[PDB]
Amino acid sequence: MNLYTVIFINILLSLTLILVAFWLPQYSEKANPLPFSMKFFLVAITFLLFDLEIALLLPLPWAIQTIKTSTMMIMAFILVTILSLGLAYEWTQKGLEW
């Protein structure tokens, strides 16, 4: 609840401040103000294949306290490594390069 109240209040403040913004003020061509970034898309799915990486690395805080601590260590290191080798391939592929 409290969290609801807060997050909701935080919104109302935001909205009001734009409410007042568009109303307090109360033509002229005042309003008058692309190729693919293949690099970007790559960077983007590089981040997708890595954000999911974190999602599989967030259990560490609660797995450190597993009885088979030796197992956790092993399982984690491989993940971090296989993902580093992936990044490394990208490096060689020069995908990381902009």
Partner: protein, 317 residues
């Protein structure tokens, strides 16, 4: 009296941010051998009220934007999140207690990216779209370095609760165990605000960025939300790395010392703006993808071992 808490939690950060607009103009000034505001108030203490009470009165020109729905949802998303990442902040007594607190701060921080995407896309312009795509690349790329620094560090306090970081620091600052993390964290907090030697977006000399087509109110909010989490990502460093005193009695001392170190880390960003030429968009990435991310992943692997071989596995709770 829970509502008394929000009213004493959001007023004292919108009234602080306001005087960071001032302090970001004087400290930069005296380095430039030039006094900042001195006139509207005694020593510029009354300047943000002027351009607060001024920007909001300028025409919020919806300039042939593709979609107002976005033009007027992006700027609100930002100040909505930024003023929310404060709700679980771990003061000696946090507004709200949230197990998974640090995740909350990470997640909400991420959503911000949209503001860039939405604002850039809605306002039809080359600069706007250009800047956005490039800007988020940075933001997203830096999340992956923040998370790990965030994760790694966790193994040490052993939970996702901000409020425990204080205990973990009951007798020492985590800056000394992890200064490598704290370095890269600083840049991942200094460059995830699209701030500092790293202001690629809103490239002003090169790009005129996304907030370009914004003015008056819609701009103010975007701004208010860049200085209200310029204080978060230093307020976290004063929790995660710099651990002030916590005594069951005298529960202010923490807040007082929290002050003393958050202003430095909020005044440390100000030396940066006035000191470093901006990184070029390619270099920023290569800083994270080919330098920080490697060190971050390896040190994460180092921190999962440190508990096991030092038998220091932190206590859940």
């Amino acid at each position: 009296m829970f509502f008394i808490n929000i009213l004493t939690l959001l007023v004292p950060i919108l009234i602080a941010m306001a005087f960071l607009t001032l302090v970001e103009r004087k400290i930069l000034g005296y380095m430039q051998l030039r006094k900042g505001p001195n006139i509207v108030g005694p020593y510029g203490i009354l300047q943000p009220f002027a351009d607060a009470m001024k920007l909001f009165m300028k025409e919020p020109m919806r300039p042939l934007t593709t979609s107002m729905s976005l033009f007027i949802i992006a700027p609100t998303l930002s100040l909505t999140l930024a003023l929310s990442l404060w709700v679980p902040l771990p003061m000696p007594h946090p507004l709200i207690n949230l197990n998974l607190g640090i995740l909350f701060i990470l997640a909400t921080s991420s959503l911000s990216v949209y503001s860039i995407l939405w604002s850039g896309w809605a306002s039809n312009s080359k600069y706007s779209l250009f800047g956005a795509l490039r800007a988020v690349a940075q933001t997203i790329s830096y999340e992956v370095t923040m998370a790990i620094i965030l994760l790694s560090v966790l193994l040490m306090n052993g939970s996702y609760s901000l409020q425990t970081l204080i205990t973990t620091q009951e007798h020492m600052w985590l800056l000394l165990p992890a200064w490598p993390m704290a370095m890269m964290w600083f840049i991942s907090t200094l460059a995830e605000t699209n701030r500092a030697p790293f202001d690629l977006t809103e490239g002003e000399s090169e790009l005129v960025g996304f907030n370009v087509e914004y003015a008056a109110g819609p701009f103010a909010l975007f701004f208010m939300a860049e200085y209200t989490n310029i204080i978060l990502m230093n307020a976290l460093t004063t929790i995660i790395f710099l651990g002030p005193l916590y005594y069951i009695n005298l529960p202010e001392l923490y807040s007082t010392n929290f002050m003393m170190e958050a202003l430095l880390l909020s005044s440390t960003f100000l030396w940066i703006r006035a000191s470093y030429p901006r990184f070029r968009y390619d270099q920023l990435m290569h800083l994270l993808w080919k330098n920080f991310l490697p060190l971050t992943l390896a040190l994460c692997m180092w921190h999962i071992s440190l508990p096991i071989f030092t038998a220091g596995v932190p206590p859940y709770m």
